[PDB]
Amino acid sequence: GTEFARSEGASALASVNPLKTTVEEALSRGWSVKSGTGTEDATKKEVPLGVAADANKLGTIALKPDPADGTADITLTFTMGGAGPKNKGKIITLTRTAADGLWKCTSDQDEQFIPKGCSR
Q: Where are the beta strands (DSSP E) in the chain?
A: 32-34, 46-48, 60-64, 74-79, 91-97, 102-107
Is the bond preceding residue 65 a cis peptide, omega within 30 degrees? yes
Eight-state DSSP code of residue 36: S
Task: Please state the φ and ψ torsions of residue 15, each to the nearest 5 degrees.
Answer: -75, -30
H runs (alpha helix) in 1-120: 5-16, 19-28
Vertex 60: Cα angle to 59 and 66 (nearest 5): 165
Q: Residue 117 is part of which domain span?
A: 1-120
**CATH code, domain with 105:** 3.30.700.10
Q: What b/e readout covers 88-103, taking b as 16+ CB neighbours within 10 angstroms?
A: eebbbbbbbeeeeeeb
Rg (CA), the chain: 15
Count of structural domains within the chain: 1
What gap in Å lies between CA 120 and CA 115, rounded to an integer? 10
Contacts of 22 (CB under 8 A, 6+ apart): 33, 47, 49, 50
Within 10 angstroms of residue 87's Cβ, the number of other Cβ atoms is 25
Eight-state DSSP code of residue 109: S
Solving technique: X-ray
Overall residue count recorded for the chain in this entry: 120
